[PDB]
Amino acid sequence: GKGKPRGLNSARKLRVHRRNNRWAETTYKKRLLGTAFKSSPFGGSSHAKGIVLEKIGIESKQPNSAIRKCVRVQLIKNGKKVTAFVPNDGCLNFVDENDEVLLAGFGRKGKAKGDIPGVRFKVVKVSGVSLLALWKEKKEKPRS
Amino acid sequence: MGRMHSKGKGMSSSAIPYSRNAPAWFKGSSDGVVEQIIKYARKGLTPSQIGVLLRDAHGVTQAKVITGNKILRILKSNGLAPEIPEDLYFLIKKAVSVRKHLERNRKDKDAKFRLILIESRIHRLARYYRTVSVLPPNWKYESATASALVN
Amino acid sequence: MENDKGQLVELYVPRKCSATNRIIKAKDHSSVQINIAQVDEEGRAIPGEYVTYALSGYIRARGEADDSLNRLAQQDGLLKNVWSYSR
Amino acid sequence: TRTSVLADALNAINNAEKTGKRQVLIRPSSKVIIKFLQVMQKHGYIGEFEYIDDHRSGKIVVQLNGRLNKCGVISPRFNVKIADVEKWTANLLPARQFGYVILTTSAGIMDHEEAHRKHVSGKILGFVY
Amino acid sequence: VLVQDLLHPTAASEARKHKLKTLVQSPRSHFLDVKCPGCLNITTVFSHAQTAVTCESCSTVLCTPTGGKAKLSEGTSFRRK
Amino acid sequence: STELTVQSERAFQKQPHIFTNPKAKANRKTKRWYKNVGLGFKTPKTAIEGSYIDKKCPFTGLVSIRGKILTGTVVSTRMHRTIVIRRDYLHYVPKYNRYEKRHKNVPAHVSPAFRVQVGDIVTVGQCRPISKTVRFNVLKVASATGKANKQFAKF
Amino acid sequence: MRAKWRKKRTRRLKRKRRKVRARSK
RNA sequence: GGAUAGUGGCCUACCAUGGUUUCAACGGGUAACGGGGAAUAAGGGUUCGAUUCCGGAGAGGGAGCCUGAGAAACGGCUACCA
RNA sequence: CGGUAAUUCCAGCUCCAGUAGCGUAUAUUAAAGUUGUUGCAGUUAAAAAGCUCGUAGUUGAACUUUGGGUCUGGUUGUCCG
RNA sequence: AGGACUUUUACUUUGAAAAAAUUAGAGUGUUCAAAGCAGGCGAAAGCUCGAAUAUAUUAGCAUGGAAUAAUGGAAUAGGACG
RNA sequence: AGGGGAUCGAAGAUGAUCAGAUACCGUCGUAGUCUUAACCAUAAACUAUGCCGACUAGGGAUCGGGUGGUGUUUUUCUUAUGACCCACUCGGCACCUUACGAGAAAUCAAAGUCUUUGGGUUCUGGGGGGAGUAUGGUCGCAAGGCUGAAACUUAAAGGAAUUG
Ligand SMILES: [Mg+2]
Ligand SMILES: [Mg+2]
Ligand SMILES: [Mg+2]
Ligand SMILES: [Mg+2]
Ligand SMILES: [Mg+2]
Ligand SMILES: [Mg+2]
Ligand SMILES: [Mg+2]
Ligand SMILES: [Mg+2]
Ligand SMILES: [Mg+2]
Ligand SMILES: [Mg+2]
Ligand SMILES: [Mg+2]
Ligand SMILES: [Mg+2]
Ligand SMILES: [Mg+2]
Ligand SMILES: [Mg+2]
Ligand SMILES: [Mg+2]
Ligand SMILES: [Mg+2]
Ligand SMILES: [Mg+2]
Ligand SMILES: [Mg+2]
Ligand SMILES: [Mg+2]
Ligand SMILES: [Mg+2]
Ligand SMILES: [Mg+2]
Ligand SMILES: [Mg+2]
Ligand SMILES: [Mg+2]
Ligand SMILES: [Mg+2]
Ligand SMILES: [Mg+2]
Ligand SMILES: [Mg+2]
Ligand SMILES: [Mg+2]
Ligand SMILES: [Mg+2]
Ligand SMILES: [Mg+2]
Ligand SMILES: [Mg+2]
Ligand SMILES: [Mg+2]
Ligand SMILES: [Mg+2]
Ligand SMILES: [Zn+2]
């Protein structure tokens, strides 16, 4: 009738067929190969600290004309270097060069979000304090 | 309509009549029929030709209807059943003929493929006859030894 | 169909095809209901008294409406040997 | 190759019912087909069938009355524990008020309600409703 | 067609259909009693014979193999069995 | 696969602590000790009057049969004084409600009292660890041949 | 581009890489 | 035969050449301790289970051992490596 | 959305959702009939090996006591005590 | 309760087993609930009901059934009984 | 590799067309096309429809075989053939109509008998690109064949049809 066998003693080929087909997915292949630990900037890590190397801005795509204020950060856990996004309006000046910054995911499963090219990480905390608390003047940078 | 080794789908066959018992018009004796079968076998005839002869020249519809036993069974009861069953023997005969044709001309590839088909059929039938112990368990078909069985 | 008290709750029992016993949909806009007039001794069609056959839309679309009506009328003593049960 | 003969019988019944006929000619006619059609008769989904001796596995002529709407075999005759009967009835039958999962028990081929009455269960053959 | 007998179809329809396809499948062949002008022996032959059947008394063929059924000789007279 | 000599090796082969007195003049063959393993298992007559020794005989040796009783089919009789039995079964994968043909290879120790060959179905019984891998002693050769009981054909 | 000519360009790149490897094998 | 508390290639001596494997052996990976269980929930399932209970293993990595009924113990010793 | 009237950016006003909780990140489950044994698709959307043979695997025609009669035990709905 | 032969399975019903905690779930005004396995009733003069059950779908053991699915008999009779 | 060596024609040689034209038009023209051995194993190797099996609907034709005609010409006096004509049947490449079934539709008599979901069975796919690439095997003299990812990037790519 259908491609799969149906006999009462065909459990083996059904199981191995499903097991061979499961590699067609992306989530299953990533989970079993464990590419997150080996290749991604973080190994299965929601957040990671890093050191700001320099202070760059990156232009947007065609339909959106602007320059999103980014920052190049070298991760401390392993030494990789990644660009990250300083989210809000007047937060670029808040983060100074060569200060510890806690990058987080960008919410799109490790893929570039919106019109910002070649970035995959937000910025949540700088120098131990959070950017959202600075942006509403609830706390101030310790300046150490 | 299967045609194991080709794309054929025919169903040309023979319909055995419903009545198993002897036909009303048949006057011959079962003992005479068995004697006729024995004589035909002693002439050196396979059971199929025996059935053909009994159907054409005589009123024997089929042996099982008249006697109660089959032709090969009747021969086996008297010990005239060949060591190699008839269909397998004819398969080896055909295979050796095609192999002869091949070794006499190499470039014919279609007959090479047909020989492959015939050898596959021979292997299947040999496996069957081996699982019923008609043939010894050491019996096998080999290209070099087929001629001796045919000859 | 039947409430535990025994009172009917169905909106309406649908008609069924008199030839295939299949029910007739409410919006089955191909099915027909034939009326055949009863005939008295002198060939006068008695008015208001007849026999009805509900042929479904399916058989009509298939092409077997007339054959089914032939058989159905032959069974109830309307036509003489117009339909043979053995083809 | 005809593997599941009951499958051929029920498929022929379904085809000859959907087209609206009142008769079917099932060719191979085993025990299981006879018992299946006998259960269908007992519950009325079928009419008045008939076995035609061939000396050759026989045949069957089945009379219908349009009361049936679908037969069907569960081709792998799954071992059905007495707990899983309700699961099959939910997955196959359209409503709990009717329909019958015809299943083969050690006490013969029976509808699921009768098997539940005997408190015995076996393999599943098919379903009728 | 919608309602129709299969248990008792018309015998004309029986001869219409193919062998192996009737209600009960029965052969269309039959046997014959042939007499050759030579002797008075009556020989029983098959309609679809496959061999050059001869009377045992005389080496004269009574049938001839053919793609279908037997083609009898010129002067042999037969009666259907 | 059995030597004609009743002892062939360097060490003498005796059943330990059963002694035949030569000073006595009964002069029977020997004093052969034996036992029945129970469970309604008939000790073979080939063991009852045999002359083998087989320390690990369930019927004549010190080993006792207790525990599992497994029926299987012989798959290898061609390693000395021991058998390799193929046990087939069906594992039930529940995610599919389907079974799965599977096989295990159980070594065992067949006594010389039994005549085994490739293909005989065998009833075998648990015992002490006899070797690194054998833990079962052959207790019955149910199918001596199976389909070779009748071999020739002479009408 | 056609898949044919992309394939051919890939084959020519393999040509260059194969001769380079053969010279240094 | 030795050793074992005791069966056992557990070790030795002499023999036999055997055992597993397409029903996946062997090898590789596991950001794998196993399980009772957790999340999830029409039904079938998918993922997790380092951790309150049961087992196993370990005391920096390795080996070796006294005492005792019980340790190859490490809040017991001996030695090497770090 | 933002290129001079921004219902989307920064604010004020009003309102909405959850509320001592709410927002984000990664992972995962249901949604996923997008893993499909129940339960997926293969003409053109991704996908029928160029075709045939063939070991293992999977699967494999029908047929071997069906009826009846009685007695009898529980459980029901019975009619009422 | 003893000798005797036991075709073998697959399947399915029932039972013994599958530790507690967990899940399900009975009883119970922790002030309700999460919970907990408590508590309740006397006249106040000691009298008390509890701490229920089910499931685990695999492997093993026993048991009733014999449809479905498979194997085996007697063909050289070396067959069965007296 | 050996044989041939007509035609046509990768490369090449030119003569044109053009802004360029070592492209299309034209004239010559090696390798090749043709073969005997040995390799190659790929094609839009397409019916882009796996194989076996069952059933479901009307209409004609066509190929191979077989049955019957109180059929017609055939001529060898009659007949036997053969060749047609009519009817039927089996098998094959096919075709027309239709939806009462199926599909996203184009359409399909199978692409039907599938939410009323289970006849047996093999292979393949899980958004696009990277990419049938790299690497590692394996086959090959070579060409290349078989097996065959990821990093990363992307909100689409794509199918059928409707109006412009
Ligand atoms: Mg774990
Ligand atoms: Mg670990
Ligand atoms: Mg754990
Ligand atoms: Mg860990
Ligand atoms: Mg612990
Ligand atoms: Mg320790
Ligand atoms: Mg430490
Ligand atoms: Mg002490
Ligand atoms: Mg230690
Ligand atoms: Mg410490
Ligand atoms: Mg300690
Ligand atoms: Mg100390
Ligand atoms: Mg404004
Ligand atoms: Mg899909
Ligand atoms: Mg395309
Ligand atoms: Mg495509
Ligand atoms: Mg294909
Ligand atoms: Mg096979
Ligand atoms: Mg069968
Ligand atoms: Mg528990
Ligand atoms: Mg609770
Ligand atoms: Mg050349
Ligand atoms: Mg040129
Ligand atoms: Mg030029
Ligand atoms: Mg040119
Ligand atoms: Mg030229
Ligand atoms: Mg290809
Ligand atoms: Mg293709
Ligand atoms: Mg993809
Ligand atoms: Mg591609
Ligand atoms: Mg390579
Ligand atoms: Mg398009
Ligand atoms: Zn004569």
Q: What is the CATH number of the domain that holds E48?
A: 2.20.25.100
Give CA–CA dist A39/A36, Å, rounded. Answer: 6
A43 residue type, one letter? G
Tell me how far apart the alpha carbons of residues E47 and E70 are, in angstroms, rounded to a whole number.
6
* Contact between residue F34 and residue F59 where contact means Cβ atoms under 8 Å apart: yes
d(C-alpha C50, C-alpha C31), whole Å? 19
Q: Which two tokens stand for residue C4?
A: 């535990």
* CA nearest to A1 within chain D: D75
Encoding tokens for residue D82?
């007495």
Quick one: tokens of F153?
């054909």
Laid out side by side, the sheet with E77-80 consists of: E42-46, E31-35, E77-80
| Contact call for E46 and B13, based on CB within 8 A | no
D118 touches D110 (CB < 8 A)? yes
Between the CA of E26 and the centroid of ligand 20 the distance, in Å, is 70
CATH class of domain segment(s) C1-87: alpha beta
- Residues sharing a CB contact under 8 Å with residue F109, sequence separation 6 or more, in sequence order: F56, F81, F82, F83, F130, F131, F134, F136, F137, F138
Residue type, F58: P
Domain range for E20: 1-81
- What strand order describes the sheet that includes D108-110? D108-110, D100-105, D123-128
Positions 56-85 in A, CB within 7 angstroms of strand I = 60, 63-66
Query: Pick from D52, D68, D84: which residue ends a domain?
Result: D68
* A24 DSSP assignment: G
For chain B, list the domains and their CATH numbers.
27-81 (no CATH), 82-151 (1.10.287.10)
Resolution (A): 3.3
In residues, how long is chain C? 87
SS3 of D88, please? helix
Protein-proximal nucleotides of chain I (any atom < 7 Å from a CB):
1-3, 9-10, 24-29, 34-42, 48, 52-55, 57-64
**Burial grade of B126 (CB within 10 A; 0-12, 13-18, 19 or more):** buried
Strands (E), chain D: 23-26, 50-52, 59-63, 100-105, 108-110, 123-128
Asked if B33 contacts B54 with a C-beta cutoff of 8 angstroms, the reply is yes
Return the closest-CA partner of residue B50 out of B77, B22, B81. B81
The region, left, alpha or beta by phi > 0 then psi within -120 to 50, assigned to residue E15 is alpha
Helix, strand or coil, per DSSP, at residue F89:
strand
- Taking 3-state DSSP, the helix, strand and coil percentages for chain B, each rounded to the nearest 5, stand at 55, 0, 45
Token pair in block for residue F121: 């179905």
Whether residues D64 and D81 fall in one domain: no
For residue E53, report the distance from its CA to the centre of ligand 24, in Å: 85
Domain locations along chain C:
1-87
How far apart (Å, rounded) are the C-alpha atoms in residues F49 and A66? 104
Q: Report residue A38 as tokens.
A: 């080996």
Displacement of CA D68 from its chain's centroid (Å): 11
CB contact under 8 A, D23 and E23: no
From the CA of G14, the nearest ligand is: 31
Indicate if CB(D2) is under 7 A from strand J. Answer: no
Q: Name the amino acid, one letter, at A118.
A: G
**Ion ligand 33, residue ranges at CB < 5 A:** E 38-39, 55, 57-58
Alpha-carbon distance E56 to E54, whole Å?
6
Q: How far apart are CA A144 and CA A129, in angstroms?
A: 12
Domain count, chain E: 1
Yes or no: say if E33 and E78 are a contact pair by the CB < 8 Å rule: yes
Quote the DSSP letter at residue A4: S
Rounded distance, CA C22 to CA D65, Å? 9
Q: Are residues D20 and D50 in the same domain?
A: yes
Question: Both D63 and D73 in a single domain?
Answer: no
Residues D77 and D101 in one domain: yes
E77 sits in which H/E element: strand E77-80
Residue where the block lists tokens 């054409």: B56
- Are D22 and D4 part of one and the same domain? yes
A122, A85 Cβ separation under 8 angstroms: yes
Coil vs helix vs strand at D66: coil
Burial of F93 (0-12, 13-18, 19+ CB in 10 A): middle
Contact E58, E46 (CB under 8 A): no
Give the pair of three-digit tokens for residue B13: 């066959």
| Chains within contact range of chain A (3+ C-beta pairs < 8 Å) | D, F
Beta strand pairing call for D59-63 and A47-54: unpaired
Closest CA to A15 of D74, F93, F89: F93
Q: Among D19, D40, D68, which residue terminates a domain?
A: D68
Count Cα neighbours of D120 within 13 Å in the Cβ-side half-sphere: 11
* CB hemisphere CA count around A39 (13 angstroms): 7
Query: How many Å from the CA of C55 to C1' of K79?
Result: 61
**Number of C-beta neighbours around residue F60 at 10 A:** 24
Instruction: Give the Cα separation of F2 and F112 in Å (integer).
Output: 7
β partners of residue C16: C23
Indicate the DSSP class of residue A23.
Answer: G
- Tell me how far CA of residue E50 lies from CA of A99, B50, C17, E79, F54, in angstroms: 105, 12, 57, 19, 70
Strand K neighbours among B 4-23, CB < 7 A: 7-12
CB of F95 within 8 Å of a chain D CB? The answer is: no
Tokens representing D96 are 């709990």
DSSP reduced 3-state for D37: helix
How close does chain D come to B18, measured CA to CA in Å?
7
F102 vs F119: CA distance, rounded Å: 18
What is the length of chain G?
Answer: 25
Q: Position F35: which residue type?
A: K
- Asked if the Cβ of residue B140 lies within 7 A of any atom of strand I, the reply is no
Query: Of D21, D47, D68, which residue sits at a domain end?
Result: D68
Which residues of F in 2-21 have their CB below 7 Å from strand J's atoms?
Answer: none
Q: Are residues D84 and D56 in the same domain?
A: no
- For F145, residues 6+ apart whose C-beta sits below 8 A from its C-beta are F120
**Helix residue spans in chain C (DSSP H):** 57-62, 65-75
Q: How far apart are CA F15 and CA F124, in angstroms?
A: 23
Tally Cβ neighbours within 10 Å of residue E12: 7
Contacting partners of chain G (3+ CB pairs under 8 A): none
Residue pair F77/F108 in contact by the 8 Å Cβ criterion: no
Domains, chain F: 1-155 (2.40.50.1000)
The structural domain count of chain D equals 2
What is the C-alpha to C-alpha distance for residues D49 and D64, in angstroms, rounded to an integer? 8
With contact defined as beta carbons under 8 Å apart, do F136 and F125 qualify?
A: yes
Eight-state DSSP code of residue F140? E
Instruction: Round to whole Å and give the CA distance between A44 and A47.
Output: 9
Do D3 and D64 lie in one domain? The reply is yes
By DSSP bridging, strand C32-39 and strand A47-54 are: unpaired
Protein-proximal nucleotides of chain H (any atom < 7 Å from a CB):
7-10, 14, 16, 18-24, 30-31, 42-48
Distance CA F57, CA F41 (A): 14
* D4, closest residue in chain A (CA to CA): A7
Domain of D85, in residue numbers: 69-129
CB atoms B18 and E20 under 8 Å: no
Token pair listed for C63: 């092409």
CB F90 within 8 A of CB F99: yes
